Amino acid sequence: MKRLTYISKFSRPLSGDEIEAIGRISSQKNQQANVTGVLLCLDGIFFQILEGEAEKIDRIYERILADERHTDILCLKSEVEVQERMFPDWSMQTINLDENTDFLIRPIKVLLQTLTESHRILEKYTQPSIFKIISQGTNPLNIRPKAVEKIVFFSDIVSFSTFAEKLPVEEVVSVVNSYFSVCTAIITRQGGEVTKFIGDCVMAYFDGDCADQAIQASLDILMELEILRNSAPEGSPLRVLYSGIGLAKGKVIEGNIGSELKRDYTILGDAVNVAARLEALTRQLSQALVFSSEVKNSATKSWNFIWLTDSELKGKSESIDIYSIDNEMTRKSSGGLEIARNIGHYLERV
Amino acid sequence: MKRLTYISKFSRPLSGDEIEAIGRISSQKNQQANVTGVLLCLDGIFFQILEGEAEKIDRIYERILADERHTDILCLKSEVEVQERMFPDWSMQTINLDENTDFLIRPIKVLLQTLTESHRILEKYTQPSIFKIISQGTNPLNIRPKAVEKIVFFSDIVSFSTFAEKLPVEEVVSVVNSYFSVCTAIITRQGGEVTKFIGDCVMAYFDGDCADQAIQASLDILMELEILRNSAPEGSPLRVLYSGIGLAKGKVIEGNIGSELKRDYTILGDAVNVAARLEALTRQLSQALVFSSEVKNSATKSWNFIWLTDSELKGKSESIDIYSIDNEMTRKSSGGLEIARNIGHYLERV
Numbered sequence: 108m109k110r111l112t113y114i115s116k117f118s119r120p121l122s123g124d125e126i127e128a129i130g131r132i133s134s135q136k137n138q139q140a141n142v143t144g145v146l147l148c149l150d151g152i153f154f155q156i157l158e159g160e161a162e163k164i165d166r167i168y169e170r171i172l173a174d175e176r177h178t179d180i181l182c183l184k185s186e187v188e189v190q191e192r193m194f195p196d197w198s199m200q201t202i203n204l205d206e207n208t209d210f211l212i213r214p215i216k217v218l219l220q221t222l223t224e225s226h227r228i229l230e231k232y233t234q235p236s237i238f239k240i241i242s243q244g245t246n247p248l249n250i251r252p253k254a255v256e257k258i259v260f261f262s263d264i265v266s267f268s269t270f271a272e273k274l275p276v277e278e279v280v281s282v283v284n285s286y287f288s289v290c291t292a293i294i295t296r297q298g299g300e301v302t303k304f305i306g307d308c309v310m311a312y313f314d315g316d317c318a319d320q321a322i323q324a325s326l327d328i329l330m331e332l333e334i335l336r337n338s339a340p341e342g343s344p345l346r347v348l349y350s351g352i353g354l355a356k357g358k359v360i361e362g363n364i365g366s367e368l369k370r371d372y373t374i375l376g377d378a379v380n381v382a383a384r385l386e387a388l389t390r391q392l393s394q395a396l397v398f399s400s401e402v403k404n405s406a407t408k409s410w411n412f413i414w415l416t417d418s419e420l421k422g423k424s425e426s427i428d429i430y431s432i433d434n435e436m437t438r439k440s441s442g443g444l445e446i447a448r449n450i451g452h453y454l455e456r457v
Numbered sequence: 458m459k460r461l462t463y464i465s466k467f468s469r470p471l472s473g474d475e476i477e478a479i480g481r482i483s484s485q486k487n488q489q490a491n492v493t494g495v496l497l498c499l500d501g502i503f504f505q506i507l508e509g510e511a512e513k514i515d516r517i518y519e520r521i522l523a524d525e526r527h528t529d530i531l532c533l534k535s536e537v538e539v540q541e542r543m544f545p546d547w548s549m550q551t552i553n554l555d556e557n558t559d560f561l562i563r564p565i566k567v568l569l570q571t572l573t574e575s576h577r578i579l580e581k582y583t584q585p586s587i588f589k590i591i592s593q594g595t596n597p598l599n600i601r602p603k604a605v606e607k608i609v610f611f612s613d614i615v616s617f618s619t620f621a622e623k624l625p626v627e628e629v630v631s632v633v634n635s636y637f638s639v640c641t642a643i644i645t646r647q648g649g650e651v652t653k654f655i656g657d658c659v660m661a662y663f664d665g666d667c668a669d670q671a672i673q674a675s676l677d678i679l680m681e682l683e684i685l686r687n688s689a690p691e692g693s694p695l696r697v698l699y700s701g702i703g704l705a706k707g708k709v710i711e712g713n714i715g716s717e718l719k720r721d722y723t724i725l726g727d728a729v730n731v732a733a734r735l736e737a738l739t740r741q742l743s744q745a746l747v748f749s750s751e752v753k754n755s756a757t758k759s760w761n762f763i764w765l766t767d768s769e770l771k772g773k774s775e776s777i778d779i780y781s782i783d784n785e786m787t788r789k790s791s792g793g794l795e796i797a798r799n800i801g802h803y804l805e806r807v
């Protein structure tokens with residue numbers, strides 16, 4: 108069996124009437140599916156626990172997920188090896204704690220609410236990989252480190268120091284956050300994971316066999332930034348926001364890395380260094396996207412690869428052959444590196 | 458008034474008897490101080506809410522903090538402008554939910570527990586700065602970005618690539634985590650903040666007027682690693698664990714930086730780049746600790762500064778004068794960079 112626990116926020120106000128109706132109808136379909144559980148509500152927050160066959164639960168939650176009456180849906184716990192149910196008598200019991208006024212339920216009310224709003228704060232500071240792991244039914248703290256092949260992605264803002272010199276601090280942060288939101292959205296939809304931000308740089312990774320997705324994500328980021336630049340208001344700093352991107356492939360260690368009190372679930376490896384160093388060369392090479400021979404050969408799609416150079420760095424005392432893709436978008440983005448060499452004037456008249 | 462909410466874990470088993478005794482005696486002192494609230498317990502977890510004068514509350518919580526019967530104490534919320542109390546009739550009401558068996562309290566029990574263990578997971582993945590901010594009575598998500606002077610700290614493991622090449626993945630992660638735990642402990646006690654790990658590198662910062670603390674932290678890290686090396690088992694990879702450290706000083710932006718769904722509270726600025734580039738030069742300069750002219754002059758203590766070189770990088774088209782400190786510990790640590798050039802043999806026979 109599978110028991111699932113999630114929380115969510117009302118998309119819009121709901122009345123006790125509407126709440127019960129959701130419950131009453133939940134209880135119905137749940138009876139029909141031998142799934143049981145409890146649904147609570149407290150000041151515009153839903154808490155629900157469901158249990159039943161993995162097959163069934165997954166489909167219910169697929170509908171619950173697509174329901175527009177709540178949002179910010181977060182699975183706190185997925186137990187995918189349950190052999191006994193916790194709420195056998197309740198197909199779907201509803202407990203509206205707002206309406207409740209009981210002696211002991213009152214202090215617990217103020218507790219749940221404080222606990223929930225604190226959890227919601229921590230969520231905003233938490234790697235996306237962690238919640239994914241949790242929803243796969245795994246406690247991320249118990250994952251042991253492993254060697255794995257990854258494609259590593261590194262990208263940063265071209266001439267970022269000029270932004271930081273010229274703009275008000277609120278503007279600088281707005282620009283970086285816009286950049287990060289664009290990269291993160293595209294990378295995530297393409298099956299990758301954004302694992303760290305450092306300065307104005309994004310570090311991300313894809314499964315080792317997913318070079319075509321790494322490359323497509325990268326091209327989509329360039330395309331999206333192009334839309335963002337040419338759609339931005341007159342005088343906006345966004346009109347001169349350009350990216351450089353570097354991709355590398357290698358065996359890295361994945362796992363919980365950090366101090367006692369603070370860890371990240373992330374990767375450690377030479378491919379990370381190589382990706383970052385490739386990305387640094389975007390300027391010298393006048394190419395907005397640059398990647399290693401290994402990424403190129405590992406890709407299966409018929410991209411228009413162009414060989415750029417043979418270069419060195421580090422370490423293994425070896426020269427690495429460096430590629431890009433030749434198309435209208437990469438040419439426009441690569442011309443963008445030139446444009447971004449002199450944006451100080453533009454930026455200081457905002 | 459000030460209302461405080463925290464959670465904590467039993468250090469060791471406590472009985473309902475012991476729990477009530479804590480309550481009964483809490484209620485007493487709380488009556489004597491016009492402070493009110495509620496204390497709940499549920500499967501080895503304490504939840505407490507206290508309210509009263511900031512003066513009083515802070516001292517109670519100072520004792521609660523120093524009490525060995527619970528641990529992992531975490532303030533979820535501090536409201537430092539309260540004008541009305543939530544539990545006027547209760548100097549300290551105790552609600553043992555373990556003992557409770559009420560109809561509605563049961564599903565709420567399983568909820569609190571799930572919510573709490575999920576929060577505890579997120580805590581391990583959360584920057585230390587966030588909890589500090591929360592305990593200062595501030596929602597970190599509402600902090601606006603600001604320009605501030607900081608001393609930036611950057612450090613990494615010397616010849617880390619050799620560790621990763623030669624050791625089992627569990628060993629590699631153990632070594633990095635030991636390193637990170639040493640740096641984090643010392644930096645935090647010296648008033649600094651560890652804000653990011655990237656690869657085997659630590660990035661941290663101190664208030665702009667705290668150069669002497671940045672420098673002392675750095676020297677303490679070197680000393681601690683020396684203890685760690687010479688105390689390590691025979692054949693241990695820890696025996697050849699050495700660090701390089703770079704410090705820079707500058708105006709940076711502090712604030713919430715990231716994508717929509719994932720941000721860090723951290724800093725953005727040229728001083729970050731300079732610190733990282735100084736640290737990279739530790740190898741070339743054969744000095745384990747290197748810092749900028751600005752850090753040197755900003756320090757007030759009578760350190761034994763040694764001038765090292767005049768070097769360049771980036772950007773502002775300027776040469777920066779680079780310093781270290783000459784004493785037995787930095788000499789031993791700097792010889793350590795040489796030792797660490799050839800640890801492949803040692804490491805592969807573990």
Ligand SMILES: Cc1cc2nc3c(=O)[nH]c(=O)nc-3n(C[C@H](O)[C@H](O)[C@H](O)COP(=O)(O)O)c2cc1C
Binds near residue numbers: 134155170173174
């Ligand atoms: C808080 C909340 C809890 C819900 N719980 C359930 C549930 O337990 N089971 C269920 O089938 N639908 C539940 N739903 C609603 C589903 O998203 C969806 O409306 C319904 O299951 C689909 O019905 P259909 O057969 O018309 O597609 C819930 C909705 C909300 C807002």
Ligand SMILES: Cc1cc2nc3c(=O)[nH]c(=O)nc-3n(C[C@H](O)[C@H](O)[C@H](O)COP(=O)(O)O)c2cc1C
Binds near residue numbers: 484522526
């Ligand atoms: C869960 C828990 C809750 C506590 N709550 C209070 C409290 O509300 N007020 C208080 O004075 N001490 C509280 N204490 C205990 C204090 O840490 C400490 O034992 C006591 O306040 C100091 O008493 P003293 O005057 O002998 O130093 C609590 C301890 C625990 C474990």
